[PDB]
Paper text:
Collagen VI is a ubiquitously expressed extracellular matrix protein that forms a structurally unique network of beaded microfilaments. All collagen VI chains consist of a relatively short triple-helical region as well as of N- and C-terminal globular structures that are largely made up of VWA domains. Von Willebrand factor A (VWA) domains consist of about 200 amino acid residues and act as interaction modules in many intra- and extracellular proteins, e.g., in copines, integrins, von Willebrand factor, complement factors B and C2, matrilins, and collagens.
One of these missense mutations, R1064Q in human (R1064Qh) that is located in the N5 domain, was found in an UCMD patient (Lampe et al., 2005). The overall structure of the mutant VWA domain is very similar to the wild-type collagen VI α3N5 domain with an rmsd of 0.54 Å. The most significant structural difference is around the C terminus where the α6 helix of the mutant has a small angle with respect to the wild-type leading to a 1.5 Å displacement of the helix in the C-terminal extension. Poor electron density after residue L1213 in the mutant precluded the unambiguous assignment of the remainder of the C-terminal extension residues K2014–G2024. The residue of the R1061Qm mutation is preceding the beginning of the β2 strand and is located near the N terminus. Comparison of the wild-type and mutant structures shows that the side chains of the wild-type arginine and mutant glutamine are surface exposed and are pointing in approximately opposite directions while the remainder of the local conformation is the same. While the arginine residue in the wild-type is in close proximity to the α2α3 loop of the neighboring molecule, the glutamine residue of the R1061Qm mutant interacts with the C-terminal part of the adjacent molecule (data not shown). The charge difference in the mutant and the difference in crystal packing also indicate the possibility that this mutation may alter intra- or intermolecular interactions and therefore disturb the assembly of collagen VI.
Numbering used by the authors: 1022 to 1214
Amino acid sequence: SGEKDVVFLIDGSEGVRSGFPLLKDFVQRVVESLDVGPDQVRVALVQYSDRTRPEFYLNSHMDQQGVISAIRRLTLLGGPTPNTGAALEFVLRNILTSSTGSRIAEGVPQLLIVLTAEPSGDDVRGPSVVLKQGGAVPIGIGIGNADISEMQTISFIPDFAVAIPTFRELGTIQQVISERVIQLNREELSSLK
């Protein structure tokens, strides 16, 4: 993979309560495929609903076992709606920063994996533009009642968006999502607009 910064942005609103254990499994499984280390892949995770709660930053746990432990202990944030736009902007402002471990200034890809299961409670259009202008490379994964149109808007290019019918089908895309993290590189990303 070379070096990558990978941020998981996870909808923790009421709509995901039932599916949350499977969401945690999926994230763990993606991380199991990566070479996590201070000099390799760094991982961060944020939950969101009507507010955004960082769980860990890119420099919080820089070995795989520790990142996996942090994922396993996650508890549902809770909340009435997924304000996905506000959460995207929070990530750009507060997570993709040198001071919290991001290698953005050195040209390391900033991969953002967004997992949500409802239509956004806020407008994602404006935030999506800002995020991509700011150097984030998002992959929007919309589960269940999420809108693939919103995932297309959020994603680095529309074709990065993924729809899956149910939380139980997250396993079916773990391999392809891992491979994106591993295979995406700075120059290839630049070539895509």
